[PDB]
Amino acid sequence: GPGSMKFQYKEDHPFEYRKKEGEKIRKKYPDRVPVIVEKAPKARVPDLDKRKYLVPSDLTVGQFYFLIRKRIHLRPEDALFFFVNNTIPPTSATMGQLYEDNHEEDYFLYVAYSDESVYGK
């Protein structure tokens, strides 16, 4: 897709596999979106147990951010930033709007997280 990110989900699966999974999820849940969430390269943070998420479309990016902070057990003092196609998304946007504007040809929205505000730093 756009951007210059690297996601292990894409390293691990060819496009045809990903598109079949993403299309299936999109069809089955019209009011939710499929999202891949992974730690950015070099980020000094834990990985999630799962990297595929089914997210309500009206959940805001901000609320999703708080959920991921909890999943990786961050302390309040710890920094964390989301990146989508190399841009930190606004917290007031809905996940559905973020999905519409950024999802890739395999129908997944890809979100990276890092303790740094520059992707890959």
Binding site: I25, L54, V55, F64
Partner: peptide
């Protein structure tokens, strides 16, 4: 479970 490779977000 069959399809538990995805985390389903609810409130």
């Amino acid at each position: 479970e069959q399809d538990d490779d995805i985390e389903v977000i609810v409130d």
